Amino acid sequence: HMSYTWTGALITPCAAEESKLPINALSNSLLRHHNMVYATTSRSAGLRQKKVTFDRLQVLDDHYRDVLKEMKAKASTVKAKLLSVEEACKLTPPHSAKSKFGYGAKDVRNLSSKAVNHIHSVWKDLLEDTVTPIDTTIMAKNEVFCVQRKPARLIVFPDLGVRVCEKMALYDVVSTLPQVVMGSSYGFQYSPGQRVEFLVNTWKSKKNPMGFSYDTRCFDSTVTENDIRVEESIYQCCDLAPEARQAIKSLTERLYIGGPLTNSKGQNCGYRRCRASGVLTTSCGNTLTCYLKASAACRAAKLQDCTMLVNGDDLVVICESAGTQEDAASLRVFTEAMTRYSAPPGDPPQPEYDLELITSCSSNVSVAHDASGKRVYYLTRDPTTPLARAAWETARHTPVNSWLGNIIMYAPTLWARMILMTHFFSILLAQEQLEKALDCQIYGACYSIEPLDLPQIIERLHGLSAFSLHSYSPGEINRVASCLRKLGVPPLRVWRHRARSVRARLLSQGGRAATCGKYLFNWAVKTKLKLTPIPAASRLDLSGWFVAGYSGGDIYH
Ligand SMILES: c1ccc(NNc2ncnc3[nH]ncc23)cc1
């Protein structure tokens, strides 16, 4: 029951790959320790292949079947629609991988006759054949990190025509079903502020709170054929059109359960029998399976008054504590149960008794003060990876701007405000690119955003307090300052000096640029300006921003 079998053919690149941090005239203003930043390449795919290849054994008990029966009861209340070919086409990212059958993502988006005719033939084939394995391409992701090197993560995806068919059959399902089945435990329904509120209220709802995060080792490779068929049985509980039922059965049998792996050169690399990382159902499937295994493991470990928070493979549990020694024993039982379910741990889970010390989705709750002096909880993270990616993006244009996603998701943080906003607004000003729309990712879905709209986006997501936060925690200040010394990033006092200049330069431009100056950089002046609601903020269409997770799902809004 191997996650993969391999032929020996290499996982090949599609273009020239850079692993060393590119340097330009702007690089040193952000980061001096260049050797600490690197990008993963196909060169390390062979090491990843070794780590993800193992036998999976699964022992399923009554706690597992009981949780599954409850999940199916909630799933039976969902009604999902088929999307038309045209609706699915418009969800395709403009730079999505082209089809092998002679059309690309722009052809799909423009509803070109060639693209639409091929999508219709893929759809008909899904309805008529429920057995033939569907081909997939395997590729090494190029991702940026700071040292202390990780091998490249692998992406496995079917052809563009198939991806459009997945949207037709399952977009509405994967967007609506997880919140129905998991309720408040479904992490992707929350903005960062709502996530903090859920975590703080949950922590407070316990008499003696204890919490832990559970890291499954290579989660996608732990997902078995049983798990994927169980996911399909949950999807089939929905009220669906008969064609959607048939397409979901076909896609499960031909694609989701497994299939052959083809490199960028057309050679057969081997065969997958675990979760594909580049399909529409990756996020929803991972979330449901992680929630199912963890809920059942909680019952096996007799954890009292468990509240879970799940985002794909990322899991955090807050429960009633039985004292440190009993909690340590309980987590070993929780881990044993997770292992029996084929979700063994990476790092063993640790009980935490301070909410601020729990890391989940690489983030933690912290405290600052608003303009009135009131204590305010907000979400932050270690800034090392955001700063290493910002250094890369300073010298190279990338298909996804992590700096922009980081400013959006972490707008109230000390590091996103002082460093990211200051650095990137300086660059955009110099290039007169404040109005140029840039792609970013929010919960795996792709958005095209103009930097000039950031004050309005931040107000809607975090409130006006994100422009007024001060008196950050000594723990948070020290982690930021320590990260800066590690990477050779100038200290926060330099950033404050640079921000007064960026602020003045934006105010000089007038209009939307002046709004950025006023709101984003009010922290940089001695005599702060009274910040009032932005009229443009109410008109913004942010409806599908925090609805569901779509990592690897090829979704554009
Ligand atoms: C709440 C939960 C999870 C996170 N993930 N971290 C992120 N960092 C950068 N860009 C992002 N886009 N979508 C998420 C995300 C952030 C907040």
The rounded distance, in Å, linking the Cα atoms of 329 and 332 is: 5
Burial class (CB in 10 A: 0-12, 13-18, 19+), 258: buried
Contact 80, 238 (CB under 8 A): yes
Residue with the smallest CA separation from ligand 1 atom 2 is 361
Question: In angstroms, rounded to a whole number, what is the distance separating the alpha carbons of residues 340 and 337?
Answer: 5
Residue 389's CB is within 10 A of a number of other CB atoms, namely 23
On whether the CB atoms of residues 551 and 283 are closer than 8 A, the answer is yes
Q: Does ligand 1 lie within 6 Å of residue 409's CB atom?
A: yes
For residue 215, say whether it is annotated as part of any ligand binding site. Answer: yes
Mutation to probe ligand 1, out of 382, 384, 409, 442 (largest number of atoms < 8 A from CB): 409
Are 135 and 99 in contact by the 8 Å Cβ rule? The answer is no
Q: Which spans in 13-147 are helix H?
A: 27-30, 45-52, 62-75, 85-89, 105-109, 113-128
Helices (H), 322-473: 324-340, 384-395, 402-409, 414-415, 422-430, 454-462
Distance 409 CA to ligand 1 centre (A): 6
Experimental method: X-ray
Which residues, 6 or more positions from 254, have their beta carbon under 8 angstroms from its beta carbon? 126, 129, 130, 131, 132, 133, 134
Of 500, 506, 502, 507, the residue nearest 525 (C-alpha): 500
- Beta bridge partner(s), residue 136: 261
Nearest to 332 by CA among 221, 224, 214: 214
For the domain 183-223+281-361, what is the CATH code? 3.30.70.270
The protein residue whose alpha carbon is closest to atom 12 in ligand 1 is 442
Q: Rounded to whole angstroms, how far apart are CA atoms 391 and 388? A: 5
- Give 120 Cα–ligand 1 centroid separation in angstroms: 35
From-to residues of CATH 3.30.70.270 in the chain: 183-223+281-361
Ligand 1 center from residue 270 Cα (angstroms)? 33
**Contact criterion met (CB below 8 Å) for 272 and 134:** no
Q: What Å resolution does this PDB entry report?
A: 1.9
How far is C-alpha 367 from the chain's CA centre? 24
313 is in an annotated binding site: yes
**How far, in Å, CA of 367 to CA of 380, rounded?**
10
- Contact at 8 Å (CB) between 316 and 309? yes
